[PDB]
Amino acid sequence: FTSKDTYLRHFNPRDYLEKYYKSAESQILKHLLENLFKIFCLDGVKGDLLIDIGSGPTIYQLLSACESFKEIIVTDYSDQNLQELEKWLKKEPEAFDWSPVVTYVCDLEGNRVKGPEKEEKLRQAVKQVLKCDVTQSQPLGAVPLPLADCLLSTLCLDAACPDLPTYRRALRNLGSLLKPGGFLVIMDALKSSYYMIGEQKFSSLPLGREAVEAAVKEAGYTIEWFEVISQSYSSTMANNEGLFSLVGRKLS
Template sequence: MAVSFNDKDIYNQKFNPRAHLDRYYSSKDGALVNDKYLEFVLKQLAKTFTAGVVEGETLIDIGTGLSIYQLLSACEVFKEIIVSDYSALCRQEFEKWLKKHPGTFDWSPVVRYVCDLEGQSEKSTQKEEKLRQRVKEILKCDVTQSQPLESSLPLSADCLLSSLCLEAACKDHDTYRRAIKNISTLLKPGGHLVMMGALEDTYYTVGDHRFSVLFYDAGFVRNALTGAGYIIKDFQVCPRPKDSAHSFSDYKGFFFVVACKETSSLTVLERIPIYGNPSFENSNQLNCGALKVSNKAIEPEERGTTGLLMPQDDNYKPEQNNGFNIAPGALPDW
């Protein structure tokens, strides 16, 4: 059943923060735990931040919502983290965690898993405290506005992070493209956008209420990013498991992307396509953070952006997914 677009103020009226956390992130039966989304993005985030692919002083999280999982690896790299959300209810719930209010959601199984990924199992008790120290501000955010953050001071980040946000905030594809450009005003040239989202999704539920989600595929996301002046450095897809039986949402999969904001000195003659290898006609190297592209064709294992395989492709195999092995029963032992 199609869901009409929700006005953004519905998130201050109908959204139940704790019900959302319990339904999607519970270590026992959370939908995003069972569907391997959390495992998928935590592995990608740990690889991105701990390997030095993305680093700097300041990170802004766009549409933080109620979650801390997306910030756990980032707090090892960035000294200043600014979180944001449109919903006052979500900002209040995040502040409860920040101030250690009793009864807040228990993220400790996720924290332990991230520490294991980073090879720092013994530091799991310190991880949340480090993140609390890194968070400097909680701001209101509206990605549909040309100045998306409500701040008294101009903000400029080395990295923008966003998880499951834009598809819920944008009513159509044009609005999504503008939203990418709006948040990009907060990012320094040469800085990185790290983004995660749902693919081919139309709704998700919290309690008894259905919230609308913008339907798009992986190709649309890539085109929106390159159209906004980004060079895609890594793009990964995690299909929804075939045995996923819940009806809390109708997503077909998830994506994870790392993209670099072009500087004026970069001239890209041909952008990376969805399938196949990129090529460039000149012999000068193009530099974007850790990315260096020359005039030779780059093999998938070299550039970290393999051909995108989705369920509709003839060559698609469930166990093959851009270098991420989604084997049955591969959930973390939480």
């Protein structure tokens, strides 16, 4: 199973963005964006602080979220990935072009702003960029942070967790960052055992709906929403059966 080490040496953040975020990849990103819209815009989910866990080099998962949460902390294990994110934050020439994705979100949200203004609201929202390891009982390190109103994690936990016990423990580690009554939002692959960035292979925990749901409940959360798309990534990308999106509340 892919080690943390392999992420630092061999996960190329720009290639990942080229592979997935420029087909099945399109159809899945469309669906994830519509779920995020639903969760952050239509549903309750609101607050002062959202912490995004395993952000990678991506910002798509934060586009509707910056409308509901004053402040966003982005986090990942790989500093190389956070640096790729930071290129976008700082509006650098070589930064990835999220404009097609941003426009789609603006569309979903009733065209009340244009892309530029939406991007400026996300850049304004992101307050800290920090290191994170979900396998650590203190995932963000030795210094305390304020407790979050929401924890967001997209396509991270299956890749971070080599087995079911570690998966449960990661949910409890992350819970320590969340205030009681805080929301846990997870989107991840279903029954996937690997994914690809070009020729480089990464492991995935092949988890099913029942296993995900039982694990989230055991870790001390209620499930408010669980939704499945049974769309696999392209044949050279992953062997997932589909993707899930769950919303949970930490117990009070």
